[PDB]
Amino acid sequence: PTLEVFLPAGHDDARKAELIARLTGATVDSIGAPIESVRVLLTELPATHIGLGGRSAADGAPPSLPVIVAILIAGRTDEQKRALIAALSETSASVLDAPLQATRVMIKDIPNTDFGIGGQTARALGR
Amino acid sequence: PTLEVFLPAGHDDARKAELIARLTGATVDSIGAPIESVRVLLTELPATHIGLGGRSAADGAPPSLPVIVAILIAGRTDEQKRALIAALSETSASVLDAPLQATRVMIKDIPNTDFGIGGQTARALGR
Amino acid sequence: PTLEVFLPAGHDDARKAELIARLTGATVDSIGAPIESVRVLLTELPATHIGLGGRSAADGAPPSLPVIVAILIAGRTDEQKRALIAALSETSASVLDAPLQATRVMIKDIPNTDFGIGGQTARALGR
């Protein structure tokens, strides 16, 4: 699985490492992915680059991050996704001290014909 | 809705804020999302990170219009999507003094099982 | 590296597998990433979702795909990035039978503090 996490700029290395550790744990627990297959990509945004309701965070918008994109090989059930969504949301909210209501998760379900690892498709690899 | 706007570096904070405000308004008009639900994420990239036709601006490609990825919960109609592409594109061209002809919008539908709002799935809510 | 390729829906599995293999080789050649580290996700788009000039592909827009978002651990040189943009663009255009001028590449650099592999940061792992 590959997570892209949009978060406010400013957090220190220890907090970011903790975010990575905890979101990875949340993923492993939720959808049973091998821990070494979980990739986390943190994308920091300045307040001037974050908008909610047409207002920038620099101009006082309420919190709107983290937004997490979770890229998964197709196959997880609806209720497994529901569990993933709950776990990533509560974990990222806790670590970053963000309101849970502000979190958003978007799963991108990728057909096994449409996903490549090492140049080989997930379908080729039996996934 | 969440818009990720891939933006070449160089615009000042006022133009970024104007873009956030006007893209948000275009989204509200075209697909009728509650304004408070519209998120804009500006992904500002150096010219060396942006390829057009196989080259960066630094290697001779013409300047880049924004590329907007519009992430929607599944369920918007074809007419709404048509209106969204037009509105976001006209707004981009107007705000950035740029050719309408080169504006880009890519819509990604997320199934309601795959979308998370405050830790709950869209489907589990009324969506 | 993590590549997301926006492409028209409807390509057959053989062509998608070829695209994944060839984009992977292009990435290894260009920036020297270990082949097993290269992940590719294809994001298929309906023609009504693909906007250029404020009109969708289904509504008569000129070719505008493939668009590739390449997320890299930071540290690649401008020359490496130039090579990557060229190779990804030429390869994806060739495989998908698309015009080179339609292609776009967007590179996101992730600091090694912001990149996770198996719950550990790239910096932790000596990357």
Numbering used by the authors:
A (entry chain B), B (entry chain C), C (entry chain A): 2 to 128
Provide text from the study.
Here, we have described a global mapping of structure–function relationships among the members of the tautomerase superfamily (TSF)4 (3, 4). From a structural perspective, the functionally diverse members of the TSF share a small, structurally similar core domain that comprises a β-α-β motif. All biochemically characterized enzymes in the superfamily fall into five reaction types, each of which uses the N-terminal proline either as a general base or a general acid. The domain structure of the TSF is relatively simple, with nearly all of the members represented by either a single β-α-β structural motif or as fusion proteins composed of two of these subdomains.
Starting from the short 4-OT, the transition to the Fused 4-OT reflects the fusion of the single β-α-β unit represented by the short 4-OTs to form proteins with two β-α-β subdomains that are roughly twice as long as the short 4-OTs. The percent identity for each pair of sequences along the similarity path is 42% between 4-OT and the Fused 4-OT, 41% between Fused 4-OT and Linker 2, 26% between Linker 2 and Linker 1, 31% between Linker 1 and CgX, and 33% between CgX and cis-CaaD. Among the characterized fusion proteins of the TSF, only two enzymes showed substantial 4-OT activity, Fused 4-OT and Linker 2. CHMI has been reported to have 4-OT activity as well. Fig. S6 indicates that the characterized Fused 4-OT protein matches best with 4-OT Level 2 subgroup 1. Indeed, both Fused 4-OT and Linker 2 were shown to be proficient tautomerases with 2-HM, whereas Linker 1, cis-CaaD, and CgX showed no activity. Compared with 4-OT, Linker 2 exhibited only a 2-fold drop in kcat/Km, whereas Fused 4-OT showed a 23-fold drop in kcat/Km. Linker 1 and Fused 4-OT do not show cis-CaaD activity. Especially interesting is that two of the key structural connections linking the 4-OT and cis-CaaD subgroups, Fused 4-OT and Linker 2, also exhibit multiple links to the MIF and MSAD subgroups as well as links between the cis-CaaD subgroup and the MIF and MSAD subgroups. We speculate that the central position of Fused 4-OT and Linker 2 in the structure similarity network offers a starting point for new studies aimed at addressing the evolution of the contemporary TSF subgroups from an ancient scaffold.
